[PDB]
Amino acid sequence: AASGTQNNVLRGEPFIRGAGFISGLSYLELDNPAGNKRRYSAWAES
């Protein structure tokens, strides 16, 4: 008899306060923990 249990839960809540570009950094957190350099520069310009 063999039994295996797998359980992994990872949740992120980015806060990017760039009015329209604020949602980009929040949506990019899905599977991408590191922030995009180009997206970060765009948010800084915003």
């Binding site: 604020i22 949602s23 929040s26 949506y27 899905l30």
Partner: protein
């Protein structure tokens, strides 16, 4: 397995011989197996701008 034989003869033849053999064997087998696996993924997303 079991076997028995008996023989007796005396002259006055006269001769007599009796043999008996009985064999019996039984084999029984049984195999049962069950496998069950459950996989559930729940993802919730909420974003406000």
């Amino acid at each position: 397995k079991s076997g028995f034989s008996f023989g007796f003869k005396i002259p006055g033849i006269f001769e007599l011989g009796i043999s008996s053999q009985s064999d019996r064997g039984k084999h029984y087998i049984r195999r049962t197996k069950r496998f069950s696996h459950t996989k559930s993924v729940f993802l919730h997303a909420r974003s406000d701008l």
